[PDB]
Copies of this chain bind each other. A is one copy, B any other.
Amino acid sequence: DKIPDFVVPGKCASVDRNKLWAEQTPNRNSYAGVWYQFALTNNPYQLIEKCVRNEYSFDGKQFVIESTGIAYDGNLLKRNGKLYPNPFGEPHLSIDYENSFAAPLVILETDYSNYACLYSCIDYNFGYHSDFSFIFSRSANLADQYVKKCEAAFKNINVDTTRFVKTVQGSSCPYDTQKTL
């Protein structure tokens, strides 16, 4: 039988969150600013298809997010999100979008000034998980050397990096306009 490539047998991977959390907590401010989506794994919840541009402001408690780009229907779209500590005290954040739902998000590795590798995973009740991965860049392109750092980090938690699809980014995107939405 055929199922989507984002439903995978087994339980979400372990991931050492406590380590990442201690490392990332004092650096929140540095995480703010603009991040471009460089690539992601097949994701049926993402409404923005191309030129995905995420603007993060940090108010000391959370990050407020404005995500913009071109939707699947060819129009411009702006979505509002928030990234805040998980409300049960687990050492991960919840990524939440307006009119949608919220999911756990772990920053598996970032150097803050070039790249960030991100990961979200959900267990189902029938022996399968679904995971969603992203490669974020501080600019419209990301150099092979940072891309490989994400590829290693995802390989290390057993994600088939063949699942990544490149996002359209670059001078063909109306970034100046997106910023005004």
Contact = CB atoms under 8 A, between A and B. Distances in A.
Given A82-B87, A101-B103, A104-B101, A125 B44 contact: yes
Contacts of A47: 125
Interface string A88-128: 10100010101111111000000000000000001111100
B122 A100 contact: yes
Contacts of A101: 101-104, 122
Interface string A63-102: 0000000001000000010101001101000101011111
Contact of A44 (B46, B80, B88, B124): B124
Chain A's interface size range is 20 to 34
A104 B103 CA distance: 12
Contacts of A98: 88, 90
A28 to B, nearest CB: 18
Nearest to A99: B90
A80 B88 contact: yes
5 contacts: A44-B126, A80-B88, A101-B122, A102-B102, A102-B103
Given A44-B124, A100-B122, 16 more contacts: A44-B125, A44-B126, A47-B125, A82-B87, A88-B96, A88-B98, A88-B99, A94-B96, A94-B102, A96-B102, A99-B123, A101-B102, A101-B103, A101-B104, A101-B122, A102-B103
